[PDB]
Write a protein that holds these residues in place. Structure first.
Motif, mmCIF file in Angstrom:
data_model
loop_
_atom_site.group_PDB
_atom_site.id
_atom_site.type_symbol
_atom_site.label_atom_id
_atom_site.label_comp_id
_atom_site.label_asym_id
_atom_site.label_seq_id
_atom_site.Cartn_x
_atom_site.Cartn_y
_atom_site.Cartn_z
ATOM 1 N N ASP A 34 -21.877 57.654 42.701
ATOM 2 C CA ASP A 34 -22.355 58.535 43.753
ATOM 3 C C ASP A 34 -21.441 59.753 43.888
ATOM 4 O OD1 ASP A 34 -20.126 57.389 44.884
ATOM 5 O OD2 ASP A 34 -21.183 56.429 46.543
ATOM 6 N N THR A 88 -19.280 60.496 46.073
ATOM 7 C CA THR A 88 -17.932 60.278 46.586
ATOM 8 C C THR A 88 -16.911 60.149 45.463
ATOM 9 O OG1 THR A 88 -17.978 57.860 46.659
ATOM 10 C CG2 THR A 88 -19.053 59.047 48.457
ATOM 11 N N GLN A 116 -34.444 50.497 65.219
ATOM 12 C CA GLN A 116 -33.260 50.349 64.376
ATOM 13 C C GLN A 116 -33.364 51.218 63.125
ATOM 14 O OE1 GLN A 116 -32.899 48.622 61.187
ATOM 15 N NE2 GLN A 116 -30.708 49.112 61.180
ATOM 16 N N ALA A 173 -31.026 54.496 62.088
ATOM 17 C CA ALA A 173 -30.308 54.556 60.817
ATOM 18 C C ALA A 173 -30.718 55.781 60.005
ATOM 19 C CB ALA A 173 -30.547 53.275 60.021
ATOM 20 N N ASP A 210 -29.263 58.979 61.637
ATOM 21 C CA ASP A 210 -27.842 59.111 61.328
ATOM 22 C C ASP A 210 -27.625 59.521 59.878
ATOM 23 O OD1 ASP A 210 -26.578 58.747 63.741
ATOM 24 O OD2 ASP A 210 -26.400 56.569 63.531
ATOM 25 N N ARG A 211 -28.457 59.016 58.965
ATOM 26 C CA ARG A 211 -28.284 59.355 57.556
ATOM 27 C C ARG A 211 -28.662 60.802 57.260
ATOM 28 N NH1 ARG A 211 -29.506 54.980 52.821
ATOM 29 N NH2 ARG A 211 -27.913 53.448 53.419
ATOM 30 N N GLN A 245 -21.501 62.192 57.334
ATOM 31 C CA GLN A 245 -20.990 60.834 57.476
ATOM 32 C C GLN A 245 -19.504 60.840 57.803
ATOM 33 O OE1 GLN A 245 -21.861 58.231 54.194
ATOM 34 N NE2 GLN A 245 -20.341 56.701 54.814
ATOM 35 N N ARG A 264 -18.974 61.827 61.437
ATOM 36 C CA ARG A 264 -19.287 60.703 62.313
ATOM 37 C C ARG A 264 -18.199 59.637 62.253
ATOM 38 N NH1 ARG A 264 -22.039 56.387 61.051
ATOM 39 N NH2 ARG A 264 -22.833 57.457 59.191
ATOM 40 N N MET A 265 -17.685 59.359 61.053
ATOM 41 C CA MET A 265 -16.617 58.377 60.900
ATOM 42 C C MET A 265 -15.355 58.810 61.632
ATOM 43 S SD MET A 265 -17.177 57.593 56.881
ATOM 44 C CE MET A 265 -16.643 55.940 56.467
ATOM 45 N N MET A 295 -31.807 49.342 57.129
ATOM 46 C CA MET A 295 -31.115 50.549 56.703
ATOM 47 C C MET A 295 -29.765 50.638 57.398
ATOM 48 S SD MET A 295 -32.715 54.394 56.378
ATOM 49 C CE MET A 295 -34.389 53.875 56.018
ATOM 50 N N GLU A 296 -28.804 51.241 56.705
ATOM 51 C CA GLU A 296 -27.461 51.464 57.223
ATOM 52 C C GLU A 296 -27.350 52.883 57.760
ATOM 53 O OE1 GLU A 296 -24.963 49.313 57.548
ATOM 54 O OE2 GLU A 296 -26.142 47.681 56.677
ATOM 55 N N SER A 297 -26.614 53.044 58.860
ATOM 56 C CA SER A 297 -26.312 54.379 59.360
ATOM 57 C C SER A 297 -25.387 55.149 58.429
ATOM 58 C CB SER A 297 -25.693 54.294 60.754
ATOM 59 O OG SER A 297 -26.611 53.752 61.688
ATOM 60 N N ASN A 298 -24.724 54.469 57.498
ATOM 61 C CA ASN A 298 -23.854 55.104 56.518
ATOM 62 C C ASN A 298 -24.584 55.175 55.184
ATOM 63 O OD1 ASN A 298 -21.713 55.589 58.229
ATOM 64 N ND2 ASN A 298 -20.587 53.732 57.663
ATOM 65 N N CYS A 299 -24.740 56.390 54.656
ATOM 66 C CA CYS A 299 -25.402 56.559 53.368
ATOM 67 C C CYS A 299 -24.499 56.163 52.208
ATOM 68 C CB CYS A 299 -25.867 58.007 53.201
ATOM 69 S SG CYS A 299 -26.658 58.359 51.616
ATOM 70 N N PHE A 300 -23.198 56.404 52.328
ATOM 71 C CA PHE A 300 -22.240 56.085 51.284
ATOM 72 C C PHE A 300 -21.274 55.017 51.778
ATOM 73 C CE2 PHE A 300 -23.554 60.482 50.612
ATOM 74 C CZ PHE A 300 -23.990 60.432 49.304
ATOM 75 N N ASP A 301 -20.717 54.271 50.833
ATOM 76 C CA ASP A 301 -19.842 53.151 51.143
ATOM 77 C C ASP A 301 -18.565 53.648 51.811
ATOM 78 O OD1 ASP A 301 -18.147 50.890 51.144
ATOM 79 O OD2 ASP A 301 -18.977 50.151 49.261
ATOM 80 N N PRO A 302 -18.199 53.125 52.985
ATOM 81 C CA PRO A 302 -16.919 53.507 53.600
ATOM 82 C C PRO A 302 -15.699 53.121 52.779
ATOM 83 C CG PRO A 302 -18.381 52.475 55.204
ATOM 84 C CD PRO A 302 -18.997 52.252 53.861
ATOM 85 N N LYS A 321 -15.135 53.611 49.567
ATOM 86 C CA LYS A 321 -14.766 54.658 48.625
ATOM 87 C C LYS A 321 -14.460 55.985 49.305
ATOM 88 C CE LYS A 321 -18.540 54.071 46.193
ATOM 89 N NZ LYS A 321 -19.005 52.771 46.740
ATOM 90 N N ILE A 322 -14.383 56.008 50.630
ATOM 91 C CA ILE A 322 -14.062 57.213 51.386
ATOM 92 C C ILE A 322 -12.631 57.108 51.885
ATOM 93 C CG2 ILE A 322 -14.589 58.564 53.441
ATOM 94 C CD1 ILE A 322 -17.455 58.014 53.108
#
Ligand SMILES: CCCCCCCCCCCCCCCCCC(=O)OC[C@H](COP(=O)([O-])OCC(O)COP(=O)([O-])OC[C@@H](COC(=O)CCCCCCCCCCCCCCCCC)OC(=O)CCCCCCCCCCCCCCCCC)OC(=O)CCCCCCCCCCCCCCCCC
Ligand SMILES: CCCCCCCCCCCCCCCCC[C@@H](O)O[C@H](CO[C@H](O)CCCCCCCCCCCCCCC)COP(=O)(O)OCC[N+](C)(C)C
Ligand SMILES: CCCCCCCCCCCCCCCCC[C@@H](O)O[C@H](CO[C@H](O)CCCCCCCCCCCCCCC)COP(=O)(O)OCC[N+](C)(C)C
Ligand SMILES: CCCCCCCC/C=C\CCCCCCCC(=O)O[C@H](COC(=O)CCCCCCC/C=C/CCCCCCCC)COP(=O)(O)OCCN
Ligand SMILES: CCCCCCCCCCCC(=O)SCCNC(=O)CCNC(=O)[C@H](O)C(C)(C)COP(=O)(O)O
Lengths: 56, 69, 175, 459, 88, 178, 52
Positions: free
Chosen positions: C72, C74, C133, C137, C140-141, C158, C161-162, G35-42, G44-45
């Motif tokens: 991906d 990242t 739900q 999601a 947020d995405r 993301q 938000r984190m 579905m996850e609110s995170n599109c990418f894996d935390p 690898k961040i």
């Protein structure tokens, strides 16, 4: 009988010949961008026992 | 008693309509018949799993025969 | 029928009552149903049987295309164009898949609302919370990315938000 | 992409080698064939674009525009051959050559991968249009119209050239793929503000934006029928396409740099719709309606949402087809009575019923009747604006009301009432005119069945 | 269908009918060409009333500029015949 | 509609027009026939009260006062004949009126039908073409040098002459053309 | 128009629907969120270590 009608209607081949030549040149242009053929991480594949390239 | 009706010429509009309908039908009736024949005799493909060690062609990922062609 | 998966598109057991006539008067709906059956449903069934007979003689298959999982955005360095391109293509594919998931959930909600009749407000709470739900999601995405969106902008959203969540959690830890 | 470009070039020697009485037939047949060939570009991949080579690519945004241009050329040829009957063979061949050169420049403009090539072709489109307007225009104001059209465009386009070369120097590339993948935010500075303005104003004046629109009535009214067709249908869309391509690198500045342009577009669409209510010339009304529709497109592009771009693409296609049809309808009556005044010829429904039907359908598509693609684009843009701000609905509804008002006003004035008594030279409609109207209108209705073909990449 | 087509004889008969139902005119004395001002000794108000009665009879209005000159029954018949396209 | 207007209306013409308007509006107010007749005779009496006035100034003032009374007491919804400029059928059949020159643009197959009608139309066209020059000459003769003073046209005065400017008056389409 | 109507599904909408069906079935068969609110894996961040 066909000499005069050819001489007065030969203009009707220019556009189809241009179309064929354009397709041929498009294939030649495709031939110059084979650096990553069967090399992408998504589409890399094992060749069939008889095939030489994945696309042309 | 019957009287003459003064009207604009309707020959040309009617002729244009007949010509347009004629050409549209001339080209589109064979297409409709061919589509019907293909649908009746050569139906859509059915989903199947990819067999072991087999790689399908690019046109084999679509189900309608006309789209595949 | 069995064409579609019944787990992705479920429905209740479809309870229906039995007729309990109370008068000697004949029911016109039953007679009309018999007439409709004998005049429409049988010729249509025969035509479909012939069509299926013709289809059975010519059987061919089409396959669902499978896509490998590529790295991906990242794990791509800043100016690596090829890894960036492949990650962006994968991200766009995932975006389409997520849109279709939301579409499936919305179809479930609509089917529940139509089916439950006068009691939809009570008998469709589970579909409603599922949609809530998935909607949260998906928002947020992908929300507020705008046109010209990309995997890099999604990653930036993301990360913002984190950071906000981490700051909130850290400040709550001191409380 | 060469399979489209090369036949278009071959159109030139083919029409220069034709007999004096076969040029129209040959050009129309081969233009239709080229349009049929170009129709194959609608197969789009979804994720990314079709990259034929380093020089050309096709997108879900470019393909409908290319098909529209290729389809518009034969209609232009059909409309032109009536008023050019007295012309010499050489001058008719020169006119057809101008049309072919314009088509070639347009098809190359919409597919260039790099912004300097796009700029070069987008400026090159000027010369054939200018020659057509100033040589085959009918009135004496065509010279002033051509001067306006040239200089309004160039005054906006030259700063774009400066900005493009500066951007290539600073970034190292102008290829659209590299531009998109290596996009970085524009800071809040005066230098970035002026870079934004230099990147935007050329496409602004090509739309045209309200306040920079004065060239359009002159050029569209004073041009011959084919010139007006190509000006309204295709050349107005160059600005929108350029905006969609160029705003990728302008974020996040567009967030507040778009305020004056949004204000101008909304209030000016109101103003031009109102202007259409009091117009004595039939072509000027169509021109101002085009201005209003392009103002709505400008709003859609400025707000930067996927629904906005989808609506903008649909509206561009629908407006092109509808405006071309309306210009042809006006030209038929002008050829009948040799005057552009709307109230000169009245009650034409009594004399020409099928042309009245064409008028009614064109007016209905102009006011965006459902489920036509005109309303699809307009509704998508209106919803996107409502998401942008709930107060935009007032202006959108006012514009809808005024648009219906002047559309039906034009229809009633030209077609209804009683005929003018002294005018007695209104002959029955020719097959050519009816066929031209049908070829305009039928693709519009057929596109309703498959709206996703014209909704663009954001679909 | 609608009413039968109107004829000159019917128009003249109806005009004479309306004029014979007028009190200030002798039935015997009245004629198709009988002038209103000269032969019947009438004034302008009586002519206005006659015109209004004709309008009520035939269900259509005659403009004042034209009604001013209808001074005999034959003129009224001619006006009505020419307005409704009656030729026989 | 058919008569050339004059430069102005006389006091007598205005008086008669006011009389007719008052009678019509009174009929609008008085729906029933007997009551309308009674009040119409009353109106006629009140109107004849000043029939033989010799002072033009007081007659004009009476006319002005009567007009003011009519305007104040007029019916807001007076009865209108259907074909009148305010009627519900005023211009209903205007869309059915087609000018006669459209018949020249008909296809020869259309004129194959109706042959006698088109032969007679040819006769009419020859008549018009052979009379036009005499019409123009007569109009030039019977006109003062300073142009015409009214919209009146002279009749024919010779043996085989037709009244000038007659084609578009004689060849009206119809009142019920379809 | 026939050619455009029978254009092959290169836009990957049927494929997207099938992929979504598979993912939904797998996710609600195990009780996982759809579905996850995170599109990418935390994992690898690598966020900046300190925020103050
Ligand atoms: C909805 C009904 C469904 C019917 C099913 C079949 C319909 C087939 C029609 C095909 C398209 C028509 C082509 C237009 C060009 C004109 C043709 C012509 O010149 O006439 C010659 C011909 C010969 O007559 P003539 O005696 O020689 O003299 C004629 C005179 O000139 C003067 O004659 P005239 O005064 O009668 O004028 C001709 C006629 C023709 O003029 C027109 O304006 C017709 C076109 C409609 C308006 C177009 C723009 C508005 C946006 C709508 C876009 C829809 C596109 C859908 C896909 C279309 C595929 C091509 O005008 C009208 O009848 C009045 C127009 C008012 C239409 C109002 C409709 C609004 C929307 C309705 C629903 C649309 C979506 C359907 C699905 C909705 C959800 C279920 O006359 C006709 O045949 C009349 C045409 C039939 C009327 C069609 C009206 C509705 C159809 C709309 C599209 C069809 C959708 C089909 C999907 C399934 C439903
Ligand atoms: C007829 C149609 C023609 C086309 C219309 C084109 C529209 C062009 C207008 C451009 C939109 C705005 C331009 C720049 C945005 C803000 C402008 C300024 O007024 O804002 C303030 C700027 O402060 C002052 O106002 C400076 C500007 C004052 C001098 C400009 C003269 C304006 C007078 C109007 C002249 C008409 C111009 C158009 C001629 C045709 C913001 O305060 P500040 O946060 O501190 O500065 C932000 C910039 N930083 C970050 C670099 C510091
Ligand atoms: C004058 C007399 C009038 C009276 C007579 C009227 C007769 C009846 C008229 C009414 C007909 C109604 C037809 C309703 C549609 C039926 C067919 C329809 O369902 O097909 C559509 C097909 O529409 C076409 O796809 C879209 C039209 C394409 C238009 C291209 C025009 C050619 C280009 C011309 C130049 C264009 C210039 C501008 C371009 C930007 C939708 O396809 P879709 O439901 O998905 O297909 C499902 C199955 N598939 C996918 C396997 C095929
Ligand atoms: C037909 C009507 C259309 C009119 C459109 C005209 C407007 C065009 C937009 C402005 C044109 C000039 C833009 C210059 C090109 C941009 C390149 C750039 O960004 O460079 C800037 C340079 O910015 C400038 O020099 C801009 C100054 C303006 C010069 C000319 C001014 C003329 C009037 C400007 C305002 C009008 C523009 C909008 C009006 C629209 C039409 C009314 C920063 O570079 P650096 O020097 O390296 O700075 C960073 C390192 N220190
Ligand atoms: C329903 C609501 C309507 C009510 C509105 C009010 C109605 C008006 C009320 C009273 C009106 C008057 O008194 S109006 C005053 C009337 N007096 C005069 O006109 C004086 C001179 N008379 C003449 O010039 C002619 O004799 C002439 C009379 C024209 C006849 O002409 P003939 O003989 O050559 O036809």
């Amino acid at each position: 009988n066909v000499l005069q009608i050819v001489r007065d209607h030969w203009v009707h081949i220019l556009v189809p010949v241009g179309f064929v030549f354009g397709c041929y040149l498009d294939r030649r242009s495709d031939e110059k961008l084979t650096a990553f053929r069967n090399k992408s991480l998504l589409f890399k594949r094992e060749l069939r026992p008889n095939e030489e390239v994945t696309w042309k | 008693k019957r009287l003459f009706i003064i009207k604009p010429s309707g020959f040309y509009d009617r002729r244009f309509l007949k010509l347009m309908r004629f050409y549209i039908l001339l080209t589109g009736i064979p297409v409709a018949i061919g589509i019907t024949l293909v649908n009746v005799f050569i139906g859509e493909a059915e989903l199947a799993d990819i067999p072991e060690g087999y790689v399908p062609e690019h046109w084999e990922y679509f189900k309608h025969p006309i789209s595949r062609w | 029928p069995d064409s579609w998966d019944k787990d992705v598109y479920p429905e209740p057991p479809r309870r229906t009552p039995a007729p309990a006539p109370q008068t000697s008067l004949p029911n016109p709906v039953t007679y009309l149903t018999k007439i409709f059956d004998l005049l429409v449903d049988r010729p249509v069934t025969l035509a479909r049987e012939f069509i299926e007979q013709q289809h059975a003689k010519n059987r061919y298959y089409y396959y669902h295309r499978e896509f490998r999982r590529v790295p991906d955005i990242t794990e791509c360095e800043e100016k690596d164009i090829l890894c960036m391109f492949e990650a962006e293509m994968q991200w766009r594919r995932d975006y389409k898949v997520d849109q279709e998931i939301v579409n499936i959930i919305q179809e479930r909600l609509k089917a529940c609302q139509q089916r439950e009749g006068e009691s939809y407000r009570q008998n469709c709470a589970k579909e409603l919370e599922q949609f809530t739900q998935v909607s949260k999601a998906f928002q947020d995405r992908y929300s507020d990315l705008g046109a010209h969106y990309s995997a890099r902008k999604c990653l930036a959203k993301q990360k913002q938000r984190m950071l906000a969540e981490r700051k909130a959690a850290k400040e709550a830890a001191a409380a | 992409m060469l399979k489209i470009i090369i036949p278009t070039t071959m159109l030139l020697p083919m029409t220069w080698m034709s007999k004096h009485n076969m040029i129209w037939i040959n050009a129309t047949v081969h233009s239709l064939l080229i349009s049929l060939i170009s129709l194959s570009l609608l197969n789009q991949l979804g994720e990314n674009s079709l990259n034929f080579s380093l020089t050309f690519f096709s997108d879900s945004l470019s393909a409908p525009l290319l098909v529209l241009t290729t389809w518009l050329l034969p209609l232009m040829l059909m409309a032109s051959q009536s008023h050019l009957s007295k012309e010499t063979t050489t001058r008719k061949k020169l006119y057809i050559t101008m049309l072919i050169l314009l088509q070639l420049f347009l098809i190359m403009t919409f597919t260039a991968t790099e912004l300097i090539l796009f700029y070069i072709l987008f400026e090159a489109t000027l010369v054939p249009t200018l020659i057509i307007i100033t040589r085959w225009g009918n009135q004496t104001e065509r010279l002033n119209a051509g001067l306006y059209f040239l200089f309004y465009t160039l005054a906006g386009s030259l700063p774009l050239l400066v900005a493009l070369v500066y951007i290539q120097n600073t970034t190292g590339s102008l290829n659209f793929l590299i531009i998109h993948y290596w996009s970085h935010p524009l800071s809040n500075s005066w230098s970035n503000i002026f870079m934004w303005l230099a990147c935007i104003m050329a496409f602004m004046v090509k739309m045209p934006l309200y306040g920079l629109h004065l060239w359009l009535p002159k050029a569209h009214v004073e041009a011959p029928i084919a010139g007006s067709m190509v000006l309204a249908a295709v050349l107005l869309k160059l600005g929108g396409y350029g905006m969609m391509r160029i705003t990728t690198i302008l974020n996040p500045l567009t967030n507040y740099m778009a305020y004056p342009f949004l204000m101008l577009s909304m209030w000016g669409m109101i103003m031009t719709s109102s202007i259409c209510l009091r117009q004595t010339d039939l072509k000027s009304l169509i021109a101002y309606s085009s201005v209003s529709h392009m103002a709505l497109v400008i709003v859609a592009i400025m707000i930067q949402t996927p629904w906005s771009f989808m609506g903008a693409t649909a509206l561009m296609i629908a407006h092109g087809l509808t405006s071309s049809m309306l210009f042809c309808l006006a030209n038929t009556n002008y050829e009948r009575v040799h005057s552009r005044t709307m109230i000169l010829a009245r009650g034409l429904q009594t004399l020409l019923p099928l042309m009245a039907t064409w008028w009614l359908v064109a007016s209905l598509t102009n006011l965006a009747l459902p489920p036509s693609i005109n309303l699809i684009g307009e509704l998508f843009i209106i919803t996107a604006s409502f998401s942008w701000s709930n107060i935009t609905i007032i202006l959108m509804g006012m514009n809808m009301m005024i648009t219906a008002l002047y559309s039906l006003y034009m229809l009633i004035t030209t077609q209804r009432g009683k005929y003018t008594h002294h005018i007695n030279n209104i002959k029955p409609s020719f097959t050519r005119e009816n066929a031209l109207m049908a070829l305009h209108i039928l693709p519009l209705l057929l596109l309703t069945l498959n709206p996703k073909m014209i909704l663009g990449p954001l679909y | 269908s609608d009413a039968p087509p109107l004829t000159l004889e019917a128009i003249k008969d109806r005009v004479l009918y309306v004029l014979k139902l007028y009190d200030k005119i002798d039935p015997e004395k009245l004629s198709v060409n009988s002038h209103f001002m000269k032969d019947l000794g009438l004034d302008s108000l009586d002519q206005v009333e006659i015109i209004m009665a004709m309008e009520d009879e035939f269900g259509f209005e005659i403009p004042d500029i034209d009604a001013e000159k209808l001074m005999c029954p034959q003129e009224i018949v001619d006006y009505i015949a020419d307005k409704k396209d009656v030729y026989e | 509609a058919f008569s050339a207007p004059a430069a102005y209306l006389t006091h007598q013409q205005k008086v008669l027009r006011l009389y007719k308007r008052a009678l019509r509006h009174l009929e609008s107010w008085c729906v029933h026939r007997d009551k309308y007749r009674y009040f119409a005779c009353l109106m006629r009496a009140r109107f004849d009260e000043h029939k033989n006035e010799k002072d033009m100034v007081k007659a004009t003032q009476l006319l002005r006062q009567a007009e003011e009374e009519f305007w104040y007491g007029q019916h807001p919804q007076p009865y209108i004949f259907p074909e009148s400029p305010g009627g519900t059928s005023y211009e209903r059949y205007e869309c059915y009126k087609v000018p006669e020159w459209c018949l020249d643009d008909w296809h020869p197959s259309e004129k194959a039908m109706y042959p006698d009608y088109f032969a007679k139309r040819e006769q009419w066209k020859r008549l018009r073409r052979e009379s036009w020059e005499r019409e123009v000459k007569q109009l030039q003769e019977e006109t003062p040098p300073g142009g015409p003073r009214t919209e009146a046209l002279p009749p024919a005065r010779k043996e085989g002459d037709l009244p000038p400017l007659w084609w578009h008056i004689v060849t009206r389409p119809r009142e019920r053309p379809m | 128009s026939t050619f455009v109507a029978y254009l092959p599904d290169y836009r990957m909408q049927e494929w997207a629907r099938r992929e979504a069906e598979r993912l939904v079935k797998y996710r609600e068969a195990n009780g996982l969120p759809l579905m996850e609110s995170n599109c990418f894996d935390p994992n690898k961040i690598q966020l900046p270590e300190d925020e103050d």
